[PDB]
Design a protein around this ligand. Structure first.
Ligand SMILES: CC(=O)SCCNC(=O)CCNC(=O)[C@H](O)C(C)(C)COP(=O)(O)OP(=O)(O)OC[C@H]1O[C@@H](n2cnc3c(N)ncnc32)[C@H](O)[C@@H]1OP(=O)(O)O
Length: 424
């Protein structure tokens, strides 16, 4: 069934294109020198892909007659998302402010990328339901690893490829003979091209209830998973400050967003390799053991991010930017994403350990939803608390990183044994 799994791979690359763009916009807005209250108001865009389960039964409960049950919300979501990308490519010339140095109207850009993300998340639900019925039962795990590789490849084409092809600096150092300004593609041309790709793949793929919410209310009423809910909400505060603010403080204190995006291309082979290493801790009877043993390493790499942002102004920016800075920040991001990926596969292994086969297909993604909510809300609280902590004499990111590391080690030393006993 190669004729369908390549189409499903292409639909997950088109899933990853809005996520890649939504991850690229904070780097662009920080390159335009916007304040962090505006950045935290933008950071609501990362929440619908986390909280897609809150409308997943609403989009899996209804469909149209004499048509596919999940194709009924695949192709209208794809058409609305593509037409919205055409309109956003028209209006993004004035939303970012590339005309006469105007300020980025971030609120309209927030609601644009928020509804855009929302459409991306419900299209992910439509494909994740569509994967169970289009291909055979024998290839059901191939759909899951195809979701993984397609999401990562489409996020690569929107976060890394777009920023690598967005500026004049990288596109006149590399990828071009006879250098010329304004880069390969702007955001208007990139959005217009992927909107055209959305419309054509949508036309080709088209021509060729409250009981679930009552169940979710009963689950979140159940005590042990409610304890896991509160724990995974208050868990990721300790490193969400580093993981949310460091990528923008590096853009302010000097390293370009294009190099910070291209810094992720050595990580996708390691993103392949690392679950094949931590598969033993996944299959083990205590799946939160590598969570609890990767928590302090992730907080110490949060301090190492704070030290790296402190070290960024003390290295020379003029002329050829040095490669030892890039090998330091690449080993830093490499070890930090090692502990990110070990923590994430520990959460996935805990959900596979706990989720019963009765309502497992809902309870699995419920715990995934609540872990991603607990990952994405202290991002917004961190970016909102950047600006009141700037005493720039004393910067706010360093005192925020110290306070959030104290919150994370407080979480660790106070709620370690409880979170370790929740798996029994
Ligand atoms: C929305 C989604 O895609 S799924 C979210 C739920 N899953 C999770 O694991 C929780 C993580 N929650 C987050 O918010 C994560 O930081 C992300 C990955 C979703 C990114 O959201 P943000 O808070 O806006 O972080 P941001 O995109 O600004 O990071 C700056 C970029 O520069 C890079 N970067 C970050 N830190 C550094 C650093 N110290 N040095 C060099 N580069 C860095 C990263 O490649 C990052 O891009 P990414 O999205 O691939 O991680």
């Amino acid at each position: 069934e190669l004729s369908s799994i390549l189409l499903l791979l292409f639909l997950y690359v088109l899933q990853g294109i809005p996520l890649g763009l939504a991850g690229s916009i904070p780097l662009i807005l920080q390159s335009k020198n916007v304040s962090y209250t505006d950045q935290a108001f933008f950071s609501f865009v990362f929440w619908p892909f986390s909280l897609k389960l809150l409308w997943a039964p609403l989009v899996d409960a209804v469909y149209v007659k004499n048509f596919g049950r999940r194709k009924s919300w695949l192709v209208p979501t794809q058409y609305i998302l593509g037409l919205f990308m055409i309109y956003l490519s028209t209006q993004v010339d004035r939303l970012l402010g590339n005309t006469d140095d105007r300020t980025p109207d971030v609120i309209a850009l927030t609601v644009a990328f928020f509804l855009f993300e929302f459409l991306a998340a419900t299209q992910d639900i439509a494909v994740d339901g569509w994967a169970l019925t289009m291909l055979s039962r024998e290839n059901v795990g191939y759909a899951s690893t195809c979701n993984s590789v397609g999401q990562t490849a489409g996020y690569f084409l929107g976060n890394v490829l777009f920023l690598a092809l967005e500026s004049a600096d990288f596109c006149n150092k590399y990828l071009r003979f006879q250098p010329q300004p304004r880069g390969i593609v702007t955001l208007s041309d990139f959005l217009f091209f992927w909107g055209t790709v959305f419309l054509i793949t949508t036309t080709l793929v088209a021509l060729l209830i409250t009981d679930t919410y009552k169940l979710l209310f009963a689950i979140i009423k159940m005590p042990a998973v409610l304890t896991f809910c509160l724990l995974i909400l208050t868990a990721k505060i300790g490193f969400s400050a580093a993981d949310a603010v460091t990528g923008l403080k590096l853009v302010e204190e000097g390293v370009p967003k294009e190099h910070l995006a291209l810094l992720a291309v050595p990580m996708v082979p390691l993103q392949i390799i690392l679950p094949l290493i931590i598969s033993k801790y996944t299959a083990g009877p205590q799946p939160l053991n590598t969570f609890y043993k990767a928590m302090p390493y992730r907080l110490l790499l949060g301090l190492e991010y704070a030290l790296l942002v402190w070290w960024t102004p003390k290295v020379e920016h003029q002329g050829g930017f040095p490669i030892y800075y890039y090998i330091v920040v690449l080993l830093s991001y490499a070890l930090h994403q090692v502990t990110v990926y070990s923590m994430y596969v520990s959460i996935m292994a805990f959900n596979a350990k706990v989720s019963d086969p009765l309502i497992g297909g809902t309870y699995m993604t419920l715990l995934n939803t609540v872990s991603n909510l607990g990952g994405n809300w202290p991002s917004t609280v961190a970016l909102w608390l950047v600006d009141p902590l700037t005493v720039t004499a004393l910067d706010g990111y360093y005192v925020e990183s110290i306070i959030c590391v104290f919150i994370g080690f407080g979480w660790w030393f106070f709620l370690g044994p409880k979170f370790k006993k929740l798996q029994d």
